[PDB]
Ligand SMILES: Nc1ncnc2c1ncn2[C@@H]1O[C@H](COP(=O)(O)OP(=O)(O)OP(=O)(O)O)[C@@H](O)[C@H]1O
């Protein structure tokens with residue numbers, strides 16, 4: 565009937581509500597945003613401050629939709645998120661692969677020993693195989709005698725998840741499921757065509773770099789880094805002697821990811837501390853600090869793609885991501901990301917926004933909303 569998201573981000577908390585229409589298309593009924601205090605690297609850092617932030621967005625969203633919120637789908641990220649790939653097996657009773665046969669094979673590959681510190685988050689079947697026929701998708705009706713699956717397992721640190729759950733539960737809400745941020749950030753920015761050719765998505769944000777790699781129409785790997793937009797924000801402050809509050813504004817209003825797209829005759833007013841006059845500083849100099857960090861950040865994604873690409877072809881599956889890299893999130897909005905990305909990467913870079921948003925489209929237009937609407941796409945499926 566009604567579905568609710570909750571992207572508890574490192575900087576802003578987004579909360580969307582929508583209703584499932586009979587055909588399937590979900591239209592958004594109400595949005596909600598609020599700055600988040602007490603957050604760092606996608607994890608909880610001050611429990612009482614994030615609880616107030618979650619209530620700020622959930623109350624304004626319950627009001628913009630004329631309905632009471634009771635259950636939510638929440639996102640989750642952090643360096644602790646890890647991915648595993650495990651194979652399984654199963655018999656095909658009465659030579660027809662019924663759905664009861666399909667979950668048994670998944671159950672076998674899913675049942676492993678991980679420990680208590682690890683919490684299972686996603687079990688994503690990649691490519692099936694049915695008697696010398698490999699790489700089949702949805703074989704619901706293929707006559708065979710036995711089948712093996714290659715499930716993709718997403719796991720996260722359990723304790724860091726309990727904190728996020730505790731925050732939402734203290735507002736009278738019930739959590740439905742935890743969702744990896746980059747997975748939702750990919751479900752709402754990608755077209756099915758791009759998935760099959762091969763793509764790399766990255767939720768560039770305040771404190772998290774949520775990477776998801778897709779080849780052959782299946783999620784292959786997921787990795788997260790803790791250096792994000794808050795790193796370049798600090799670099800501006802620490803290099804010019806300007807307060808963090810002011811250094812953020814200079815980043816959003818005059819920041820450039822390449823120190824050659826800005827003209828020498830451009831200047832910015834960077835303030836000072838102590839009671840000093842605000843100096844007028846070259847706009848090129850500002851971009852000269854943002855450029856090295858973005859290159860290093862994308863260098864981590866490049867090193868991740870290469871390590872996944874190597875171990876991918878070495879096992880016999882689609883390895884080269886054709887559609888390229890898709891950038892999203894807040895810190896992907898700076899002028900010149902596609903230019904500095906195309907230098908460190910050598911694949912198709914774009915700054916994809918949420919797609920096919922229905923109704924109330926003015927609040928789900930910018931890429932920093934992708935993770936939020938992606939929670940709706942995931943919740944739409946059951
Ligand atoms: N125009 C802009 N140019 C450069 N950076 C920007 C711009 N607008 C926003 N940002 C950066 O985007 C970041 C916020 O990202 P975003 O809102 O997507 O994160 P979030 O949802 O709060 O959390 P998460 O860390 O989990 O992605 C901030 O670090 C901010 O500096």
Ligand SMILES: [Mg+2]
Nearest residue numbers: 573745769935
């Ligand atoms: Mg986010």
